[PDB]
């Protein structure tokens, strides 16, 4: 269970960055550890990109900053780019050599991702005796502080 899912936009001399944070409550009987990673395959987040396209990037393909799940819009100075003229493989963008001196702009979707930054309640406890033969110790849900994976971006597990 996840709460307070903030984007946390930052605008810097180096460029934009996301430092957003969320609060997570785990299932029972789990020991989450620092920098453990979560992905939420149901939830897709919008992001934007722009690249200048040059002979090297034509031959080698543009390595995308984000782990693009799908493209919602792609365009250039000459207009929209049609799906026969671009391809994504291995999170590389390949373009028709037609565009050897153009800049391409994209809107994309990617899966939501988090890393465990800190643990706000790492232990909660209960001895349970009712209807048990003897007292059983049980570990109640942890509260996690989750930070978004902007700076270093890794593929989805599958």
């Amino acid at each position: 269970a996840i709460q307070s899912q903030e984007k946390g936009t930052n605008q810097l001399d180096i460029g934009i960055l996301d430092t957003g944070t969320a609060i997570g409550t785990t299932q029972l009987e789990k020991r989450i550890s620092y920098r453990d990673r979560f992905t939420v395959p149901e939830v897709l987040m919008p992001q934007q990109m722009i690249y200048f396209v040059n002979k090297d990037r034509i031959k080698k393909g543009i390595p995308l900053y984000y782990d693009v799940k799908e493209i919602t819009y792609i365009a250039t100075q000459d207009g929209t780019v049609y799906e026969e003229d671009y391809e994504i493989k291995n999170n590389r963008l390949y373009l028709n050599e037609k565009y050897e001196n153009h800049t391409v702009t994209l809107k994309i979707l990617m899966t939501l991702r988090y890393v465990v930054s800190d643990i706000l309640k790492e232990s909660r406890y209960q001895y349970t005796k009712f209807n048990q033969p003897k007292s059983k110790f049980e570990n109640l849900p942890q509260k996690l502080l989750l930070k978004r994976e902007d700076v270093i971006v890794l593929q989805d597990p599958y």
Partner: protein, 50 residues
């Protein structure tokens, strides 16, 4: 009896042991006696000498 309490178990909260069937048989034998007195009847076969 248990069929009429489908989805319930009677269980000692200090041990988790279910109640023994001996109590069920005891209660049934007394319930038959009660039924044989609420109505002026003999349910179970027996030889009577009068």
């Amino acid at each position: 009896v248990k069929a009429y309490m489908f989805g319930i178990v009677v269980q000692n909260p200090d041990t988790g042991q279910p109640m023994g069937d001996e109590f069920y048989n005891h209660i049934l034998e007394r319930a038959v006696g009660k039924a044989e007195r609420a109505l002026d009847i003999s349910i179970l076969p027996d030889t009577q000498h009068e």
